[PDB]
Design a protein around this ligand. Structure first.
Ligand SMILES: [Cl-]
Ligand SMILES: [Cl-]
Ligand SMILES: [Cl-]
Ligand SMILES: [Cl-]
Ligand code: NA
Lengths: 436, 441
C-alpha cells in the first residue's frame, strides 16, 4: 500500500491547484473588518490564518479534519489489544485528510522508530544541562541542536527549486517527530530519575515508545500516552505554539528551528501550563478540605474561591458551549481504569458542581471544563508526578499537529507571514482621519 | 544640582503610566472604529497589509525610510550621544530612545553602558555548553541555544511563579532584558572565536560602550571597526513589528515567556533565509559577478552584466521595494561610512558602480517597483573590509542588533498589559463555506 509520503505526493497537486484557483477567483472577497480594538487586542477574531488540520466547532468541540473526538476514537486504527486511537495515525489524517489502514500505520510507526536515534552532540548537550534549567528550555535547546541534521536547510543552500521544498520539509518532520520521545525521555530521566534510559523498540508504536523510554511499562499508562498525544495534538492555527511554528517556518526556517520556536511559545505560562495550574489548585483544595469531597464542601470551596476574586482554573470558554470533548475522553479513561482514585473523585465532583456554581456567580461564559482540567489527574495516577515536566509531554503531542501544517505550507507555497504594525501615535492619526 | 540624573529604569517608570493610560483611553473611546478590511487573499497571503500589530519604536515612512520614534536615520545620527572621539551614534543610546521616546544625555548613556557591561558575564554552564557545541552547528542555532540556556537566570519567570501582581511584570521583564542584552556580545563572540578562530576570547571592558565590547570580544581593538559596530548595531536595531523576528519575539512574549525564550524564538525566525540572510545573498551575488567580469567594474561592463542577469530571468538581490520610494537611508548611512573610511576599496567600488548603474537598468527593464537598494546591499562589503569574512556568522551580528529593537517592545507590552496574540484560523474547506455565504448574500 502507499506510504504516507507517497499518498501525500499523489494527492497534494490537486489540492494545491484548488487553493490557487480559490485564491485567484475569490481573493478579493471581503471576509472581515479590522477594528482598532483587535490591533490592541492580540488580533483576536482576525481571520488571518489558514490551518488545514483542525477547526473549532463552537457546538461540538475541536474537529480533526472534520471529525469530533469520539469520531476520531472510532475511526483511527488501534494497536492490537487496545482501543485508544494511535497518534501516528492522527498524524497521517492531519497531513492527508484520510484514515490509514492498519498496515499503513504499522509501517509509519516502524519508520518513526527507525528515525529516532539522536546524535552524540545532543546526548552530550542534554546530559550537561543543569537540573534547574526548566525541562521546556532543555527541550527546545535539544531540538535546535538537531539543526545540523536538517535536510531542508541543506537543500535550500544547494538551491533546489520551490517545488521540492515540501519533500525535504517532510523528511525533516518525520526525523524530528521520531526523535522527540527520545529527547523528552532523556530530559525526564536526567532531571527526575537516574539518568538511565532504555532503547527504542523498533516494533513499538509511538506512544508506547514514549511511555517505555520515560520508564513506564504499565500497559494502561501506554494507553494513556496514546490517548494523551492524540487529543493534545492540534487545536487550530491561532494558538501561540502552532502560530509561532508556522510564522518561523514561513521564513523558511527548518522544522527544527520552527518547532523549537513553537516550543518556546508553548512554554509561556498563558499557553502551556494550564494542566499544572489545575493540579496545583486541586492539591491546595484537597489539603484545605482534608479530603472531604461532599457536594456541600466543594460548592462552598468554589464560592469562597470566587468571592475572593480567584479563578476556578480550567473551566469556561469564550465560544465552545459544552464540555470540551478532550476533557470527556480523559474522564472516560479514568472511569474505565480507576473510578475510585481519590484525586479523580475530586475532579469528577468538581465537574458535577462547578458548572452550576459558576453559572450562578454569573461572570463565566460557558462554564464547562477544558482538556487541562483532566490531564494531570491521569498522569498522577501512574506516578508521573513531576508537574514541571508536563508541558514537555504537551510539546511532543503538539508536534503531531504543527508538523503537517509546515509540510502543507511548503507544498502550497504559503508566503512569509508579515502583518503590518503602527505606533500608537500613528494609529491615533489614522483613527482621526477615519472618523472625519 | 548635587542629585544624580535618572537611570533608564527610573525614567521609564516615571513616564509609562501616563502612556499606558492614554492607550487604555484610546482603546475605550475608539476601539469600535473600523481601521481596515480583511480580504480572502490576505489570509492566504501571510496577513500582508493587515493592520494588526502595535509596535511603538519604529514605523516605515514610505517617503523617507524607517523612523525610530519619529526620527530619520540622519536625525538619529545627529541627535544620539556618541562615544568620545567618535561620530557614530551609540546603539545603547538608541535602546534608550526606543524604550522611552526620548533622547538621553551623554551622562545617562555612559551610565547605561556601564550597567550593560556589568551584566555581561555568562554562567559557567553556558560557557561550557558553547565550548562543546560542534563547529558545524550553524552559528544562529548556537546563538539561540545559548540564549535559551540563560532561562535558569530569568527574574520574570521566578516572579511569575511567586504570583506577583501584573503591576510588577514590566520591572522584571526590564531586568531580564538588560541582563540578556548585556550578555549578547559575549555569547556572539564566543561563537565566533570557537567556530572560526582559536577559541580564545578576551574579557569585557567595564568602561567600554556596547559596540566597542562586541568589537573587542570578536578580537578587534582598532577604532574604525569599533565605529562600524556602533553604526551597524544602530541601523539594524529595529524595523517595525511585522517582520518575522520582531513579530515572533512579541508573539512568544505575549504568552508571558521570558525575554530569554522570546528572543531565542525571534532568533530562530531571523535564521530563516527569507528574513535574515539578505546580506549574505548580496555578497554571494557580488562575488559571482566579480569572478565573471574579472574585476572590470566599468559602468559599461556592470550595465551589461545587469542586463544579462535580468534578460536571463534572474534577479538583482537587494534592490527594489514594495512601498519605500527611494534609497533606504540605512544604505546611505553605510555608503557614507565607506566613503569616509575606504572610498577606493575594490569591493566598495563594485558596490558603488552597482549603485550608479542598477537603478536605471532596473527601471528600463520595467519589472522592479522602486528600484533602489536596501540596507542589505551595503552591509557585507563593510564587514569584508575589516576581515570579518565568515558569512555564516553575519546573521548573528544582525541578531545582536535586533535585540536592541525587540526588547524595548517586550518591556512596553508588559507595562501596558498587551494580551496574548491569538488571530483566528480556518481550513480551506471552512474558508470556502464562509466565502460562499458572503458571496451569496
Ligand atoms: Cl492549544
Ligand atoms: Cl494560545
Ligand atoms: Cl527587518
Ligand atoms: Cl520579515
Ligand atoms: Na557534525
Amino acid at each position: 500500500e502507499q506510504t504516507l509520503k507517497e499518498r501525500f505526493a499523489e494527492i497534494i497537486p490537486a489540492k494545491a491547484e484548488e487553493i490557487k484557483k480559490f485564491k485567484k477567483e475569490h481573493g478579493k472577497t471581503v471576509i472581515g473588518e479590522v477594528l482598532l480594538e483587535q490591533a490592541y487586542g492580540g488580533m483576536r477574531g482576525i481571520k488571518g490564518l489558514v490551518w488545514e488540520g483542525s477547526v473549532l466547532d463552537p457546538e461540538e468541540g475541536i474537529r480533526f479534519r472534520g471529525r469530533t473526538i469520539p469520531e476520531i476514537q472510532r475511526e483511527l486504527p488501534k494497536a492490537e489489544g487496545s482501543t485508544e486511537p494511535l497518534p501516528e495515525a492522527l498524524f497521517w489524517l492531519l497531513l492527508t485528510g484520510e484514515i490509514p489502514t492498519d498496515a499503513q500505520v504499522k509501517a509509519l510507526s516502524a519508520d518513526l522508530a527507525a528515525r529516532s536515534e539522536i546524535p552524540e552532540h545532543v546526548i552530550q548537550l542534554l546530559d550537561s544541562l543543569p537540573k534547574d534549567l526548566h525541562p521546556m528550555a532543555q527541550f527546545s535547546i535539544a531540538v535546535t541542536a538537531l539543526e545540523s541534521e536538517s535536510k531542508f536547510a541543506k537543500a535550500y543552500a544547494q538551491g533546489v527549486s520551490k517545488k521540492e521544498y515540501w519533500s525535504y520539509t517532510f523528511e525533516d518532520s518525520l526525523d524530528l517527530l521520531g526523535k522527540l520521545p527520545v529527547i523528552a525521555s532523556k530530559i525526564y530521566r536526567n532531571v527526575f530519575k537516574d539518568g538511565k534510559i532504555t532503547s527504542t523498540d523498533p516494533n513499538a508504536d509511538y506512544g508506547k515508545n514514549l511511555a517505555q523510554l520515560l520508564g513506564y511499562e504499565n500497559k494502561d499508562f501506554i494507553d494513556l500516552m496514546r490517548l494523551y498525544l492524540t487529543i493534545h495534538s492540534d487545536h487550530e492555527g491561532g494558538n501561540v505554539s502552532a502560530h509561532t511554528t508556522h510564522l518561523v517556518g514561513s521564513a523558511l526556517s527548518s522544522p527544527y528551528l520552527s518547532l523549537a520556536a513553537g516550543l518556546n511559545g508553548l512554554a509561556g505560562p498563558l499557553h502551556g501550563r494550564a494542566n499544572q495550574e489545575v493540579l496545583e489548585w486541586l492539591f491546595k483544595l484537597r489539603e484545605e478540605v482534608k479530603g472531604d469531597y461532599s457536594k456541600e464542601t466543594i460548592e462552598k470551596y468554589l464560592w469562597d474561591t470566587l468571592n475572593a476574586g480567584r479563578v476556578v482554573p480550567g473551566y469556561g470558554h469564550a465560544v465552545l458551549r459544552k464540555t470540551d470533548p478532550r476533557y470527556t475522553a480523559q474522564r472516560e479513561f479514568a472511569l474505565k481504569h480507576f473510578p475510585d482514585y481519590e484525586l479523580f473523585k475530586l475532579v469528577s465532583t468538581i465537574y458535577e458542581v462547578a458548572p452550576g456554581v459558576l453559572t450562578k456567580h454569573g461572570k463565566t461564559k460557558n462554564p464547562w471544563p477544558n482538556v487541562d482540567s483532566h490531564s494531570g489527574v491521569l498522569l498522577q495516577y501512574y506516578g508521573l508526578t513531576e508537574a514541571s515536566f508536563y508541558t514537555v509531554l504537551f510539546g511532543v503531542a503538539r508536534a503531531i499537529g504543527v508538523l503537517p501544517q509546515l509540510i502543507i505550507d511548503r507544498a502550497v507555497g504559503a508566503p512569509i507571514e508579515r502583518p503590518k504594525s503602527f505606533s500608537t501615535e500613528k494609529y491615533k492619526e489614522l483613527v482621526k482621519k477615519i472618523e472625519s
